Design a protein around this ligand. Structure first.
Ligand SMILES: [Cl-]
Length: 214
């Protein structure tokens, strides 16, 4: 009789891969079948992976995601029983870019900047960082970018005042999670060419409003 594979054991091998191994059972196993799924899913949603050796690498997994898996051996009698179930979480990976930058332009020197959360957070987002700087026409920076420091970096909007009139700026936003910073979303805009709309600001502490010429 083919026994259950023994000491099933899984470890994350990145954000998108898990290595799962086990000890061969007694009884002339000819190979193994691994079933794996996202913790919470059903077993018609389970993936089935064959292997000829007592380990596999699971691939094309979701970052920062709990998986469940188990493995059986097969041989002359067919399939033996499955191992006990093991769980393992993939690593976080940096988020994707934030959503496209939205500018609500108030005046020739003031604009609100906002953005959607990254389509793939690949973890929990703990901060955004906004940078901005003067550019010419080739998106060529004129001097250094500035980075904005704020009390609550999880907010997805900023008010920027005292920008240089009739001058284009590049703005970037990136997001951070436990794995670090992802790619930036960039936009280049000159407030002079934008239609203006007034906005209301509550007179309260901690409004995230930044002076562009510190
Ligand atoms: Cl990976």
């Amino acid at each position: 009789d083919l026994g259950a594979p023994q000491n099933p054991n899984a470890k994350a091998a990145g954000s998108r891969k898990i290595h799962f191994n086990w000890l061969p059972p007694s009884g002339k196993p000819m190979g193994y079948r691994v079933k794996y799924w996202i913790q919470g899913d059903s077993e018609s949603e389970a993936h089935l992976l064959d292997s000829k050796v007592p380990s596999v690498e699971l691939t094309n997994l979701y970052p920062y995601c709990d998986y469940e898996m188990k493995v059986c051996a097969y041989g002359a009698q067919g399939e033996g029983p499955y191992s006990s179930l093991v769980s393992c979480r993939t690593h976080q990976e940096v988020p994707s870019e934030p959503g496209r930058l939205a500018f609500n332009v108030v005046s020739s020197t003031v604009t609100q900047l906002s953005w959607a959360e990254p389509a793939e957070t690949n973890g929990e987002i703990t901060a955004y960082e906004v940078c901005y700087g003067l550019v010419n026409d080739d998106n060529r920076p004129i001097g250094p970018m500035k980075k904005v420091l704020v009390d609550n970096p999880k907010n997805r909007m900023l008010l920027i005042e005292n920008l240089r009139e009739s001058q284009p700026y590049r703005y970037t936003v990136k997001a951070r999670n436990g794995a670090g910073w992802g790619p930036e979303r960039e936009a280049i805009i000159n407030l002079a060419t934008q239609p203006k709309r007034p906005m209301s600001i509550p007179i309260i502490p901690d409004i995230p409003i930044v002076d562009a010429q510190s």
